[PDB]
């Protein structure tokens, strides 16, 4: 439209011709999109198989005038542009792109309409087509969890990768060397017989029918070796519970083989406590005797404790089993109906009883609880099961005929189980899919004990101390057990049998949001492994340090009971290093985190203006607190508010409408009555005192006096965002493709950038630099250029991106802000440290945010009378002609207040003849002088770089021209 509306009178840009041409073209493409929108959005493209999409459409009539249509592809398990395709006029498209094999795909069409980026149509998606499988896998299998169970074993859980490139066959594990193939259904492996106290390296690879994929790398320590107590220095104590005689025994060489409790009734099950030292005794009839002891002897007798049945318990239920939670201080019971086994948890008083699970006919031989790892295990004669403490998730571990007495180690995460019918060692993990043998010395024991690497096997007269490889006929030490008929329960009385310590912790993902004198910090908790439950407890206290780099001083604050912490009393404009650790109940803390360079805001009342998607506006500080809900009510989806003076502001909404608002008194102040459609952005020049906006329908820039509403079209084309430098009058504009400069003269026009698309920019007038955001294909790339070295400051990858016109320059901090497209987060990048991207969360009263501005502490300066051109004196416009062909017009030169460059624009009227001139002197030569004494009309418009003066219109008589040569 610049080349169609080219006139020799108004040069170089006939502005209303160009504006009418551009608005008619956008009206044409809007009416074409509204015509063909239903036929696009009903018709589904079909796939057939080179791969061919048939769409039941046709190319438009002005087909080369529009933008390219894009086939877009989507993984079934955002839309990216397909690069290689071949379409004819009936949309019978052939994909020449090398697709990823064995990946399902969906395809759609994008039809743009003209050069306007708003007018696109999207077709519906195709039915899902999977690529046929070929070749090696290209995605490494990402490990979920990888840890050492104990000093000899190592556990890994993983998931398959994204592009398997074939049907899945097997995963290959290499441990450095130990190699093992596992099939496709299993994603968890546990190694064995490792060295203690060295780290191993695990290399995991994916294998399909065609080949082997890439290799995933892992560094993982085993547990250190436990201290081996000999027979001469064995200081442990055991409590062996038989059915009719219970005896406590010392594992010293001089040990006391001493009576604690004899019961003539047969006891069905026991429950053992560590801090209380209480052995609850449940007999064969179902009544419960709570029996407190102390260090192997009586301090209190047995008390009959009655369990509440309640409205859960409809029928008769006779209890048989016992287990005591050492975190929750709660018991768990298995009960017998006289017709099924149902397990009901209860309190120590016995009143708060609630069932878990469902009833089953199998008899539970032993009930044991891992209170640290959050599990209750029931073992019956058919299977061993695993339940969480709230009864939410149910799992069965192993099916076997008649298992014997199992022992759960919480920090080893290995159930050691001993069938007396087999007579061989069995290790089950907590998921139950790992079953392992070990050597056992031959005798059949009903129960056992594990003490480090040592194994205690109770004989009918003695006790056998082995190390699972030496023989049971020659123990290292023996203790007499002659008064016991048989040994159904052996309890090892160590503090490691019931620990409160999870023995693993390292915090991560530490985030610090800083203010002038305070900081809010949040860190992620260390995640749970699959071996413990959601009912497992890791209740900790976190210790945080601030390391001042100015004084090099480390201050540590401890006992923080949550992951969020509001730290106060920081000196402003100072940088620190902030590091967190997690301390357990036992006082063993975690390791250090990596420190982040945390610089505070400088001192001052730094208020941020948030605007919602519903038009509510609030003022916070830079931490997001201290909120004042403002009195005014904006329209729906507003952009950043541009202030002219302290009462009148201008903003753009999400549909392109431009609105004026008077904050103080709403009855007067806005010079334009109606909102104006198709506006990209808005800005204001305080020195000229002019409001500049991009009219997107006219691809022009409109300059408006805010005191009168007089609008001037200004020759800047296809612009979206504006910022004007008030020192020199240069306008800076950003298109969708390029970012450049427009001055008063054509010599000052310089192009800074050409490309995704430019999302926002901001002008730094003081330091003479410029920043802009390029919103590419899933990567926000931020840049910097001087106003006279182009570098990329920071590239942020992800599906989340910025709102267009949302990059502001935080002057006091020296940072850049952009609101995210979800409206619940803002991102801040400092200039001195480019790599750290702090996030500011959004206050919940304005929950989807559409605008965020930094309010300046000084007020806005008033308009300058030093840039206003004075009016040209109409008496001084003389038509003085010289000799020969010099027929010219002169006037007294218009100045400004401050001495600025005043150019002129001039119009001649010889009746119907017209002539326009652009001048830089008070002088114009008239060429095509008609010689027959007409009344010339002269109009002068003086201007500066910032604004324009008034028009001087005179009418002058021509001097007589006798020669015509």
């Amino acid at each position: 439209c610049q080349e169609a509306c080219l006139s020799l009178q108004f040069y170089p840009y006939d502005m209303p011709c160009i504006g009418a041409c551009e608005m008619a073209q956008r009206d044409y493409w809007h009416l074409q999109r509204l015509a063909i929108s239903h036929l696009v959005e009903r018709t589904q493209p079909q796939l057939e198989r080179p791969l061919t999409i048939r769409w039941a459409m046709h190319f438009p009539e002005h087909y080369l005038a529009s933008r390219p249509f894009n086939i877009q592809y989507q993984f079934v398990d955002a839309w990216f542009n397909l690069a290689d395709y071949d379409c004819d006029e009936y949309y019978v498209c052939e994909i020449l792109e090398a697709l990823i094999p064995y990946t399902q795909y969906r395809f759609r069409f994008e039809l743009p309409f003209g050069e306007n980026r708003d007018e696109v149509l999207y077709s519906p998606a195709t039915p899902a087509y999977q690529t046929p499988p070929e070749g090696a896998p290209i995605s490494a299998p990402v490990i979920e969890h990888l840890m050492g169970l104990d000093d000899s074993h190592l556990a890994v859980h993983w998931h398959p990768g994204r592009f398997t490139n074939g049907p899945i066959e097997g995963y290959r594990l290499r441990l450095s060397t130990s190699e093992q193939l596992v099939p496709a259904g299993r994603g968890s492996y546990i190694f064995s017989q490792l060295q203690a106290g060295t780290n191993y390296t695990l290399a995991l690879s994916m294998i399909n029918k065609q080949g082997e994929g890439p290799v995933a790398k892992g560094f993982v320590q085993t547990h250190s070796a436990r201290n081996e107590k000999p027979a001469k220095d064995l200081t442990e104590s055991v409590l062996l519970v038989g059915r009719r005689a219970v005896m406590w025994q010392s594992l010293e060489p001089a040990g006391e083989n001493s009576m604690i409790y004899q019961s003539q009734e047969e006891l069905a099950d026991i429950a053992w406590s560590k801090r209380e030292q209480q052995l609850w005794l449940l007999n064969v009839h179902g009544e419960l005797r709570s029996l407190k002891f102390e260090s192997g002897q009586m301090v209190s007798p047995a008390q009959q404790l009655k369990l509440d049945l309640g409205n859960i318990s409809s029928g008769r239920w006779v209890p048989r089993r016992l287990s005591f939670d050492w975190l929750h201080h709660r018991l768990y019971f298995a009960m017998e109906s006289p017709e099924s086994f149902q397990i009901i948890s209860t309190d120590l008083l016995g009143e708060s009883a609630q069932k878990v699970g469902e009833s089953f006919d199998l008899p539970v031989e032993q009930l044991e609880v891992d209170a640290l790892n959050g599990w209750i295990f029931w073992r019956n004669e058919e299977s061993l099961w695993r339940q969480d403490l709230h009864g939410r998730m149910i799992h069965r571990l192993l099916r076997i005929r008649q298992p014997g007495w199992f022992l759960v180690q919480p920090q080893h995460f290995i159930i050691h189980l001993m069938l007396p019918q087999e007579g061989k060692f069995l290790e089950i993990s907590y998921d139950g899919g790992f079953k392992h043998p070990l050597p056992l010395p031959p005798p059949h024991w009903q129960s056992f004990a594990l003490l480090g690497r040592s194994l205690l096997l109770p004989d009918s007269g003695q006790l056998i101390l082995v190390e699972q490889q030496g023989q049971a006929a020659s123990p290292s030490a023996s203790w007499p057990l002659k008064n016991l008929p048989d040994c159904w329960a052996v309890i090892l009385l160590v503090p490691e049998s019931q620990p409160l310590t999870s023995a693993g912790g390292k915090p991560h993902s530490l985030k610090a949001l800083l203010g002038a004198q305070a900081a809010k910090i949040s860190w992620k908790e260390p995640e749970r492994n699959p071996y413990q439950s959601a009912d497992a407890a890791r209740s900790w206290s976190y210790e945080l340090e601030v390391l001042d780099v100015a004084s090099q001083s480390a201050f540590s604050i401890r006992n923080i009971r949550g992951p969020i912490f509001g730290l106060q009393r920081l000196q402003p404009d100072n940088l620190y290093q902030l590091r967190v650790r997690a301390i357990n109940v036992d006082g063993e803390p975690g390791e250090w985190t990596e420190p982040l360079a945390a610089r505070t805001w400088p001192l001052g009342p730094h208020r941020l203006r948030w605007a919602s998607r519903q038009g509510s506006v609030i003022h916070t500080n830079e931490l997001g607190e201290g909120l004042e809900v403002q009195q005014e009510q904006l329209e729906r989806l507003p952009g950043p508010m541009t202030m002219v003076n302290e009462s009148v502001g201008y903003y753009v909404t999400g549909d392109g409408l431009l609105h004026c608002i008077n904050l103080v008194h709403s009855q007067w102040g806005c010079p334009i009555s109606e909102p104006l459609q198709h506006v990209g952005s808005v800005t204001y020049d305080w020195r000229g005192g002019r409001v500049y906006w991009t009219d997107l329908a006219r691809n022009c820039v409109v300059r408006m006096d805010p005191w009168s509403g007089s609008r001037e079209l200004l020759p800047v084309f296809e612009a979206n965002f504006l910022a004007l430098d008030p020192r020199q009058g240069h306008l800076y504009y950003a298109t969708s493709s390029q970012l450049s400069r427009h001055g008063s003269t054509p010599d000052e026009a310089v192009t800074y950038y050409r490309v995704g698309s430019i999302a926002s920019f901001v002008l730094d007038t003081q330091q003479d630099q410029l920043f802009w955001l390029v919103k590419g294909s899933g990567a926000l790339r931020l840049y910097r250029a001087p106003l006279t070295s182009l570098q990329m400051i920071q590239q942020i990858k992800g599906v989340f991106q910025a709102v267009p016109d949302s990059l502001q320059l935080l002057r006091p901090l020296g940072a850049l802000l952009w609101l995210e497209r979800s409206g619940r987060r803002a991102r801040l990048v400092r200039l001195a440290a480019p790599l750290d991207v702090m996030e500011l969360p959004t206050p919940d009263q304005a929950s989807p945010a559409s605008a965020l501005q930094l309010l300046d502490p000084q007020p806005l300066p008033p308009r300058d009378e030093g840039v206003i051109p004075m009016t040209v004196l109409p008496d001084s416009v003389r038509l003085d002609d010289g000799h020969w062909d010099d027929f010219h017009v002169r006037w007294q030169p218009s100045t400004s207040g401050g001495n600025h460059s005043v150019s002129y624009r001039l119009l001649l009227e010889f009746g119907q003849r017209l002539q326009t001139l652009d001048l830089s002197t008070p002088f114009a030569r008239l060429t095509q002088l008609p010689q027959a004494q007409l009344q010339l009309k002269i109009s002068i418009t003086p201007r500066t770089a910032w604004r324009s003066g008034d028009t001087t219109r005179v009418q002058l008589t021509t001097p007589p021209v006798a020669p015509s040569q």
Binding site: F59, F69, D88, E115
Partner: protein, 476 residues
């Protein structure tokens, strides 16, 4: 209906910037036999993203157009509308979008040599040319394609060249059976191998420099030789790896092929590891940092050798090439940057490298192809590396002198530390003076030997350095 066929080509001349361009070929729509041949006005709009790159209006009977100045690694959209030019009625429309990727895409053109001539077979349009008419048939054929130069060995055992626009020039005449032929395109050195017919038969590698050719018959120089009883086959020159790789086999055992070579700078012998003995070797991708080799073992299977990792590499073209049989993969196999060509059952099959599928199959006569060669992308160094260096430096190093003579060594010059490859066509020119006594115009690699010097006497040598490209550009 006939579809729009767009191929990108990357054409690189030495001392010039590589130019990547798009060749568009579209056939005409079907016309009646009563109507004559009509002019079709083809309108092309080329788009980069959302902006317009080029726009051309052409009156052609069938569309053969070329869009210049494309950029690598960017998606372009060519929108072609075909109208009848006399009436304005729309004959058709097409929309080709194209990621460029010039390492995997090229124009499907081969150079075929029968007993009569050497021609170009474009596999898209199925059209044959004749570049040069040969009086005697061609046995081996290599080329330099920055200057469109063909180099070949005839049946009368003579090595010849051809530039377009001239006669076939005789380069060398040699007196033994030539087993293989190769060219370094950068340094303009032609390497071949001659049979040595002693009772342990050998093969001697001869080299010739193209910068020393001024119109008369040159003679080769012996550089290396194989150990005795062994023979060469399929010489491939790798300039950016600075290697000369052949298939060394022992006489009487041709299916024991082992990948041997020399290093082109210092002359050291180099070995490459294969998992199986070989029968045949062909040149690969020839791209810097990713050079391959297509090599066939004794069971008639192919590996794509990565020569930096020295390993076989799995591809989707490998099973489709191994399905053709041993004689097709062992007889004629060529690879340019975009395709990979085999000859099976009087038909040339072109397999694409990007899409990894069979793209073209062109039937032949039973004696149209005896030799096949491809327009492989000969990647040139940048303009500071090919040319004469700026700084002089102490390139001349004096050895330990005797009283009678000094062995002045003439090494080979790289332009800077940023240029790893040698400068082409290096000629020292020396005055000898008593600190002229002697004048030499001598190339790089040899030595100057400096006889009849007086004992206990200082001497001086002074020399200018010249290259082929500074004589071509008339630089000082």
């Amino acid at each position: 209906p006939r579809r729009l066929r767009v191929f990108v080509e990357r054409l690189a001349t030495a001392l010039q910037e590589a130019n990547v361009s798009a060749v568009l070929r579209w056939d005409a729509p079907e016309q009646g036999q009563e109507a004559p041949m009509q002019a079709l006005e083809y309108h092309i709009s080329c788009w980069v993203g959302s902006e317009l790159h080029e726009e051309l209006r052409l009156n052609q009977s069938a569309l053969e157009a070329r869009v210049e100045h494309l950029q690598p690694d960017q998606t372009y959209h060519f929108q072609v509308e075909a109208r009848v030019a006399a009436t304005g009625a729309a004959a058709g429309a097409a929309s080709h979008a194209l990621h460029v990727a010039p390492e995997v895409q090229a124009v499907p053109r081969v150079l075929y040599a029968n007993a009569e001539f050497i021609g170009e077979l474009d596999l898209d349009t199925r059209n044959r040319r004749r570049l040069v008419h040969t009086a005697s048939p061609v046995e081996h054929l290599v080329g330099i394609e920055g200057e469109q130069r063909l180099l070949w060995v005839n049946e009368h055992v003579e090595l010849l060249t051809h530039v377009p626009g001239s006669a076939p020039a005789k380069l060398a005449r040699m007196r033994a059976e030539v087993l293989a032929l190769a060219v370094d395109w950068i340094q303009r050195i032609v390497y071949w191998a001659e049979l040595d017919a002693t009772a342990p038969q050998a093969a001697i590698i001869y080299r010739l420099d193209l910068c020393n050719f001024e119109g008369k018959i040159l003679q080769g120089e012996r550089v290396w030789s194989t150990p005795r009883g062994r023979l060469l086959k399929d010489l491939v020159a790798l300039p950016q790896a600075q290697s000369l790789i052949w298939l060394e086999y022992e006489q009487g055992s041709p299916r024991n092929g082992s990948l041997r070579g020399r290093n082109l700078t210092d002359g050291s012998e180099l070995e490459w590891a294969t998992v199986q003995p070989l029968i045949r070797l062909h040149a690969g991708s020839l791209e810097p940092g990713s050079e391959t080799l297509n090599l066939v073992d004794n069971q008639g299977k192919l590996c794509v050798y990565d020569v930096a990792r020295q390993l076989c590499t799995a591809s989707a073209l490998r099973a489709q090439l191994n399905l053709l049989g041993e004689d097709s993969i062992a007889g004629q196999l060529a690879q340019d940057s975009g395709y990979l060509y085999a000859v099976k059952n009087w038909s040339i099959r072109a397999y694409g490298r990007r899409r990894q599928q069979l793209e073209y199959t062109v039937e032949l006569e039973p004696e149209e192809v005896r030799l096949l060669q491809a327009h492989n992308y000969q990647a040139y160094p940048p303009k500071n590396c090919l040319l004469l260096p700026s700084s002089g430096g102490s390139l001349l190093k004096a050895t330990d002198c005797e009283e009678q003579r000094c062995l002045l060594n003439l090494p080979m010059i790289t332009a800077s530390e940023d240029c790893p490859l040698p400068i082409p066509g290096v000629r020292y020119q020396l005055n000898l003076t008593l600190a002229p006594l002697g004048q030499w115009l001598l190339g790089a690699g040899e030595s100057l030997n400096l006889t009849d010097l007086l004992p206990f006497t200082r001497y001086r040598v002074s020399g200018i350095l010249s290259s082929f490209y500074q004589k071509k550009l008339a630089l000082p």
